[PDB]
């Protein structure tokens, strides 16, 4: 844009939280589907749902990990990784049922003299293999 | 029997119900062959005591 808007420079705001980035590579919407609330025609439990809205739909930052030459990779599961995150976690443990979409923002800056490439994958039903 | 539905005693949401009772119609409940007997016959020579 001639007003300066860039594919690389984004701002995301959810609830009381804002993320800025100046070196993005656009952003992905998985399978082209934006998150949505459950529609009446697809509904199943009949009780009134709770929708905590801004109290749970906000950015939670997890513990920072460290990338080195010996790193083989990292994994997390959702909603598990957020089970202890504020009122989202509370709502999760108080109810039998729950559904949620997510904005995932992975952060890793370095310098024009560093190099490396992280593949960041969101996998539906990411069943992992056991040690046995 | 008290004809209640969930919205009578709790807060409910709107749900568009798609389920049906098609398989529990009297016809559907009985629409199966069931074994009622086993008959035994043979093809042996008839002889004076059998």
Q: Do A43 and B14 touch (CB under 8 A)?
A: yes
Distance CA A96, CA A90 (A): 12
- Resolution of the coordinates in A? 2.9
- For tokens 């529609």, name the residue: A39
Q: What string of DSSP letters covers A69-112?
A: TT-------TTGGGTTSHHHHHHHHH-S---------------T
Q: Tell me, yes or no, if B15 comes closer than 8 A to chain A by beta carbon.
A: yes
Residue in chain B lying closest to A39 (CA): B15
Nearest residue to A100 via CA among A118, A83, A76: A83
Q: Do A43 and B13 touch (CB under 8 A)?
A: yes
Planar angle of CA A16, A101, A95, nearest 5 degrees: 90
A9 close to A22: Cβ distance less than 8 angstroms: yes
Q: Which residues contact A15 (CB under 8 A, 6 or more apart)?
A: A54, A55, A57, A58, A59
Residue in chain B lying closest to A41 (CA): B16
Token output for A126 = 């990411």
Distance from CA of B10 to the nearest CA of A (A): 7
Q: Which residues contact A50 (CB under 8 A, 6 or more apart)?
A: A91, A95
B13 close to A47: Cβ distance less than 8 angstroms: yes
Experimental method: X-ray
Distance CA A126, CA A99 (A): 17
| Residues in chain B within 8 Å Cβ distance of A47 | 6, 10-13
């Amino acid at each position: 844009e001639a007003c300066g808007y860039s594919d690389r420079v984004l701002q995301l705001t959810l609830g009381n939280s804002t993320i800025t980035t100046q070196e993005a590579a656009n952003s992905v919407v998985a399978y082209g589907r934006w998150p949505e609330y459950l529609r009446d025609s697809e509904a199943n439990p009949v009780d009134q749902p709770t929708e905590p809205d801004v109290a749970a739909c906000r950015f939670y930052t997890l513990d920072t990990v460290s990338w080195t030459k010996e790193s083989r990779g990292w994994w997390w599961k959702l909603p598990d990784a957020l089970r202890d995150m504020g009122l989202f976690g509370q709502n999760m443990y108080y109810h039998y049922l729950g559904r949620s979409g997510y904005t995932v923002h992975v952060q890793c800056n370095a310098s024009k003299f560093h190099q490396g490439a992280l593949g960041v994958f969101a996998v539906p039903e990411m069943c992992l293999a056991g040690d046995s | 029997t008290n004809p209640l539905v969930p919205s009578d005693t709790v807060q409910t949401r709107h749900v568009v119900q798609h389920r049906s009772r098609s398989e529990s119609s009297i016809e559907s409940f009985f629409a199966r062959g069931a074994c009622v007997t086993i008959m035994t016959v043979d093809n042996s020579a008839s002889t004076t005591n059998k």
